[PDB]
Amino acid sequence: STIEEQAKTFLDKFNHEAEDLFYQSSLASWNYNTNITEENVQNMNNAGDKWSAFLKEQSTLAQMYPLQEIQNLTVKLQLQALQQNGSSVLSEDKSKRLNTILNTMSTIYSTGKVCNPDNPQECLLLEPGLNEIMANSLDYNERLWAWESWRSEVGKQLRPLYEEYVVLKNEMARANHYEDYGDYWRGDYEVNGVDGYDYSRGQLIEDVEHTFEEIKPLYEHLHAYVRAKLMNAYPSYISPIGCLPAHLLGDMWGRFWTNLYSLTVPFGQKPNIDVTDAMVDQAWDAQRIFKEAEKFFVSVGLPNMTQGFWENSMLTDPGNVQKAVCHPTAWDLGKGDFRILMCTKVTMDDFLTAHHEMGHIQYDMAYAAQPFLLRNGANEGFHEAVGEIMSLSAATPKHLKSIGLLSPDFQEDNETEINFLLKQALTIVGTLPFTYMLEKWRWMVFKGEIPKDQWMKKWWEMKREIVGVVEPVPHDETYCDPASLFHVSNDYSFIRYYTRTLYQFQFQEALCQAAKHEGPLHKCDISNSTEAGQKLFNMLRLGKSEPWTLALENVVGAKNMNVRPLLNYFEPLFTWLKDQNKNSFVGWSTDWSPYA
Amino acid sequence: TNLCPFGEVFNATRFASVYAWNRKRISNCVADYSVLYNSASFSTFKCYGVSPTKLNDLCFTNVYADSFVIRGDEVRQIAPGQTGKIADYNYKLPDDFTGCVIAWNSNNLDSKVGGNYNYLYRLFRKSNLKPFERDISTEIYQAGSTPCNGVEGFNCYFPLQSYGFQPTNGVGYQPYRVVVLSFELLHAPATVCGP
Numbered sequence: 001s002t003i004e005e006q007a008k009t010f011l012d013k014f015n016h017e018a019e020d021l022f023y024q025s026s027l028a029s030w031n032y033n034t035n036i037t038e039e040n041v042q043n044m045n046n047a048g049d050k051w052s053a054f055l056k057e058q059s060t061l062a063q064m065y066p067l068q069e070i071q072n073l074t075v076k077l078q079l080q081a082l083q084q085n086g087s088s089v090l091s092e093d094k095s096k097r098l099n100t101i102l103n104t105m106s107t108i109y110s111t112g113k114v115c116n117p118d119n120p121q122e123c124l125l126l127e128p129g130l131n132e133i134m135a136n137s138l139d140y141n142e143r144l145w146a147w148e149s150w151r152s153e154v155g156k157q158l159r160p161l162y163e164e165y166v167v168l169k170n171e172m173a174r175a176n177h178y179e180d181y182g183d184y185w186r187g188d189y190e191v192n193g194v195d196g197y198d199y200s201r202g203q204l205i206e207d208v209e210h211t212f213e214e215i216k217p218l219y220e221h222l223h224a225y226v227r228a229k230l231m232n233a234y235p236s237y238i239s240p241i242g243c244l245p246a247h248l249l250g251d252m253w254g255r256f257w258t259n260l261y262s263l264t265v266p267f268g269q270k271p272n273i274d275v276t277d278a279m280v281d282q283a284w285d286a287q288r289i290f291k292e293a294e295k296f297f298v299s300v301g302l303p304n305m306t307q308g309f310w311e312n313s314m315l316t317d318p319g320n321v322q323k324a325v326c327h328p329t330a331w332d333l334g335k336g337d338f339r340i341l342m343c344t345k346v347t348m349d350d351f352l353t354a355h356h357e358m359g360h361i362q363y364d365m366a367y368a369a370q371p372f373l374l375r376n377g378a379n380e381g382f383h384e385a386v387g388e389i390m391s392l393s394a395a396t397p398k399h400l401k402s403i404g405l406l407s408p409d410f411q412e413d414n415e416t417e418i419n420f421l422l423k424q425a426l427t428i429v430g431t432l433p434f435t436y437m438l439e440k441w442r443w444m445v446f447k448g449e450i451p452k453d454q455w456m457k458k459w460w461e462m463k464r465e466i467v468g469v470v471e472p473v474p475h476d477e478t479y480c481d482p483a484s485l486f487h488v489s490n491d492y493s494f495i496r497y498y499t500r501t502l503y504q505f506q507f508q509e510a511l512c513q514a515a516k517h518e519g520p521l522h523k524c525d526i527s528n529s530t531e532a533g534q535k536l537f538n539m540l541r542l543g544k545s546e547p548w549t550l551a552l553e554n555v556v557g558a559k560n561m562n563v564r565p566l567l568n569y570f571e572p573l574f575t576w577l578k579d580q581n582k583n584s585f586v587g588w589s590t591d592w593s594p595y596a
Numbered sequence: 597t598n599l600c601p602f603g604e605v606f607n608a609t610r611f612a613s614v615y616a617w618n619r620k621r622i623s624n625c626v627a628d629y630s631v632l633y634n635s636a637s638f639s640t641f642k643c644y645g646v647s648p649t650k651l652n653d654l655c656f657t658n659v660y661a662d663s664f665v666i667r668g669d670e671v672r673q674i675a676p677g678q679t680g681k682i683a684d685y686n687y688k689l690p691d692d693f694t695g696c697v698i699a700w701n702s703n704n705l706d707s708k709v710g711g712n713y714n715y716l717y718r719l720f721r722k723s724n725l726k727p728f729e730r731d732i733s734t735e736i737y738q739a740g741s742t743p744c745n746g747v748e749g750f751n752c753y754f755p756l757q758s759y760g761f762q763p764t765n766g767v768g769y770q771p772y773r774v775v776v777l778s779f780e781l782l783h784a785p786a787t788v789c790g791p
């Protein structure tokens with residue numbers, strides 16, 4: 001028996017063993033997440049520890065089959081995915097050191113508190129205390145106090161840990177034969193040995209930067225309109241040519257500009273479409289919301305939900321004494337067990353989230369027939385892109401009018417179109433320079449292009465230049481402001497939010513063309529289009545079995561990330577923005593700061 | 597009027613594992629086949645060669661009842677000319693099979709919270725099964741070229757794997773009880789007629 005035949009038989013055993021061990025751990029995790037008890041936290045840990053131990057042992061056995069003697073690519077994909085050392089290429093001492101660093105940074109972030117001057121007992125955590133300030137307060141000094149205190153008391157604790165974290169992650173990555181830890185992260189997009197579909201780790205940098213140049217004009221005009229509006233609210237705090245103060249952006253970091261809508265809304269007399277009142281008027285419950293979402297997917301040719309979905313999911317707060325983690329989640333437990341966990345209220349927001357989460361389920365169901373290790377999105381940005389396009393269609397006035405929640409006597413006027421597109425751009429476009437800027441700094445740190453004694457200097461240089469945002473207080477190298485964001489202190493890659501944003505509009509544009517939608521892309525609803533459903537399913541059932549370049553070509557006809565669909569979606573706003581900014585300054589000087 | 601003992605096959609407390617499938621030779625009795633095919637408790641009831649429709653009008657020399665448990669997605673493998681882990685390594689029907697395959701979902705009986713591991717199937721074998729063959733061996737499967745010495749290790753796998761039947765699995769993963777009726781015809785007695 002050849003080495004490839006041995007790997008096929010080894011993967012055969014793994015798939016059958018993993019399927020049941022993963023199911024047990026998912027079952028125990030589910031029971032804790034829907035019923036919080038001490039008994040459940042232990043059972044969740046015991047089943048999780050066995051599954052992790054099983055993975056650790058199977059990774060070692062897989063390393064005894066060298067990839068160099070395998071030709072069948074679908075075998076090489078699974079063998080490689082399981083083979084990956086991870087932290088286990090380091091000595092046990094450096095691994096243990098690194099795991100201690102990771103757990104301390106996570107604990108500092110989640111238990112970091114800030115107390116108000118003159119009451120050392122009135123203290124706030126990030127969630128909900130500081131986040132409430134940064135999303136709701138209009139008082140300049142309150143927002144400034146929360147922004148600076150978070151970074152001065154929690155960020156400074158993270159600075160020495162993050163330095164050591166960089167050193168150990170880079171050793172781990174270089175021992176796995178990557179240039180650095182950022183190169184390791186870019187490996188999620190790597191494709192090799194498929195003629196015409198290959199993709200290198202360095203090509204991601206070039207494609208992100210190339211497509212970001214095309215985003216700059218829309219962002220510059222969004223930045224200029226937002227700055228002018230804020231300058232009217234805060235005339236003594238905002239320069240007409242300067243960057244936006246970092247603490248005036250709607251959350252703790254300006255990751256999203258969503259909460260600037262009330263001060264920036266173009267036409268403040270035309271109300272939002274808010275369909276929650278009609279839902280309560282018609283006595284909708286959670287089951288109706290998820291039944292409508294199921295109808296939506298069935299209308300485009302996708303299967304209905306399984307019987308176990310309706311029996312085993314948790315679609316309402318259990319309420320009472322029995323407690324549950326209510327963050328909406330789609331569960332793929334394996335063995336044909338698909339569930340949604342969601343404390344659904346009767347609101348338009350939760351109606352859209354249900355379509356989003358059921359989109360995840362449809363993706364999970366479609367690649368269930370793939371081998372265990374290929375049961376995932378084509379790359380890190382596919383799953384979330386599939387979930388987002390479902391709420392795009394479900395939220396349109398056309399769709400809300402066909403399900404009887406939006407009055408037939410509501411017609412779209414262009415002023416409500418601009419309000420909607422501006423709300424969308426505050427969240428979707430606003431985050432793109434923030435996301436690119438943050439990952440770039442991490443990539444340069446891991447690469448070694450930024451010395452330790454210039455980490456914060458370069459962080460705020462790039463914030464000013466790329467994002468148009470300025471720090472309200474100067475920060476020396478005792479700060480670690482990037483680590484004050486969850487994803488950085490908790491060791492999660494961040495470019496996925498950039499790539500997913502471009503994918504979702506490529507998906508939506510392709511699906512809406514297959515649905516023969518006429519008019520602006522942002523009004524499209526793919527309901528009742530089995531042609532759109534088939535084009536999406538052709539990608540969904542691939543899972544991870546094909547290169548992401550090919551899976552993307554299945555839906556959109558192109559092999560690469562493309563920014564044009566995103567620009568097409570926001571074009572009505574772009575034109576209106578450019579006319580609004582005729583007598584404002586467009587662009588920003590980087591030398592102005594609020595501390596003068 | 598000796599009635600064919602079909603109740604002991606269909607209503608057994610526990611079924612056999614498919615790798616160790618059970619055979620019950622039925623003889624010298626009267627089979628009311630129609631009662632099964634026209635009872636609507638089965639999800640699968642497909643006959644090959646014979647016709648379910650009132651062919652309780654024929655005489656056979658011996659009737660064999662094979663019974664076992666598999667997952668629902670594997671019921672498709674109990675048929676002539678099928679491939680897969682069940683058809684190749686556990687239970688193989690011939691190309692010219694004359695008989696019926698009966699199956700029903702047994703999630704209420706053969707699943708258990710935490711998992712029912714009573715039922716096994718053969719995951720590895722050096723070759724495929726001849727029709728109506730039964731391999732109950734427990735030899736460690738040699739996947740490489742180094743002898744196993746009767747224990748599992750690198751390239752050495754225990755050949756039998758367990759289904760973990762949990763009540764919350766999807767239908768494709770839920771247990772199904774299967775009865776396969778063979779109708780034999782030799783130049784001899786003809787003892788099972790059954791009006």
Ligand SMILES: *[C@@H]1O[C@H](CO)[C@@H](O)[C@H](O)[C@H]1NC(C)=O
Pocket residue numbers: 035037038039040322
């Ligand atoms: C909650 O968990 C306990 C064990 O921790 C269990 O006995 C109880 O039945 C559970 N309740 C619900 C409603 O699931």
Ligand SMILES: *[C@@H]1O[C@H](CO)[C@@H](O)[C@H](O)[C@H]1NC(C)=O
Pocket residue numbers: 008072073074075
């Ligand atoms: C790879 O192996 C699987 C099963 O071992 C087989 O079904 C598939 O056709 C093979 N692909 C190639 C290209 O040989």
Ligand SMILES: *[C@@H]1O[C@H](CO)[C@@H](O)[C@H](O)[C@H]1NC(C)=O
Pocket residue numbers: 304305306307
């Ligand atoms: C799903 O649709 C199938 C028909 O394709 C039907 O047999 C089944 O009962 C449906 N189940 C649910 C939960 O809607």
Ligand SMILES: *[C@@H]1O[C@H](CO)[C@@H](O)[C@H](O)[C@H]1NC(C)=O
Pocket residue numbers: 602603604606607
């Ligand atoms: C199994 O038991 C049920 C209920 O007693 C009966 O209706 C059925 O006929 C039995 N099965 C057979 C094969 O007789």
Ligand SMILES: [Zn+2]
Pocket residue numbers: 356360383384387
């Ligand atoms: Zn999601």
